Amino acid sequence: AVRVAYAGLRRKEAFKALAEKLGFTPLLFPVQATEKVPVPEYRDQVRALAQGVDLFLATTGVGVRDLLEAGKALGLDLEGPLAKAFRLARGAKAARALKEAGLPPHAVGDGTSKSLLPLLPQGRGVAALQLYGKPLPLLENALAERGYRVLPLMPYRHLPDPEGILRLEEALLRGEVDALAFVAAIQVEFLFEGAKDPKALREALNTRVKALAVGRVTADALREWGVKPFYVDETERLGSLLQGFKRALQKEVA
């Protein structure tokens, strides 16, 4: 059977079940860990946001929801300040969380920091930036260039799983799997930032193991490391990813 590794954390069980039903042998190699930051640890930043900001930049839906919950747990009104701020969402997920909170964004990017550049207004004041544990230097530097003091808000953190990354790298270099599925760009970044031999890993993902990407932003992360995905799915459904890959693979053979 075709052996397909999954680098995600959240939907492992669904991945395994669906892969088995489609005739693949699934392997689970998560490359990330996720931890919520205790509300008291960033209370200072939430209080600052409650004093009012000129711009609010959301990067993830989870982050928007977590921040609003932190405001409630601290007894702070964040809806008022957020209603007055110019609101940006990096992509659709952050945008949907803001819309569901009755704070729809004024502009929305395409899921990437670079897509926000034309939407970042030259201004004065404070820009609150919601993060998720990974540095966003392009954004942080652009907010400062645009005239704002940056107020970071990190309600949770995605971190690499170092041991998990090394185990996946060994499996890929061993020829232990036929394909590897990435469901978020950060999983591509953690694998390549944590590999012992990134050049060998690039060679393996270009010539021996097929890289599969859920989302254009995940595919672009692979391409920035010199890897071209064999198949890119744009539905966010694991059944689509897997089935689309199965057909693509066979079309080649036939």
Q: Strands of 179-182's sheet, edge to edge?
A: 25-28, 3-6, 179-182, 210-214, 231-233
In the chain, where the domains are located: 1-31+161-254, 37-155
Same fold, 1-31+161-254 and 37-155: yes
Q: Compute the distance between CA of residue 248 and CA of residue 98 in angstroms, rounded to an integer.
A: 37
* DSSP characters over 212-240: EEESHHHHHHHHHTT---SEEE-S--HHH
Tokens 């992360």 -> residue:
221
Q: CATH for 1-31+161-254, among 3.40.50.9100, 2.40.30.170, 3.30.465.10, 3.40.50.10090?
A: 3.40.50.10090
249 Cβ neighbours under 8 A, 6+ residues apart: 2, 210
Tokens encoding 208:
């021996």
For the chain, the residue count is 254
Provide the resolution (angstroms).
Answer: 1.3
CATH topology of domain 37-155: Rossmann fold (3.40.50)
Burial of 216 (0-12, 13-18, 19+ CB in 10 A): middle
Q: Compute the distance between CA of residue 159 and CA of residue 132 in angstroms, rounded to an integer.
A: 9
- Structure determined by: X-ray
Tokens 């689309």 -> residue:
244
Q: Calculate the CA 197 to chain-centre distance.
A: 23
Q: In this structure, are residues 149 and 128 in contact, taking their beta carbons and an 8 Å threshold?
A: no
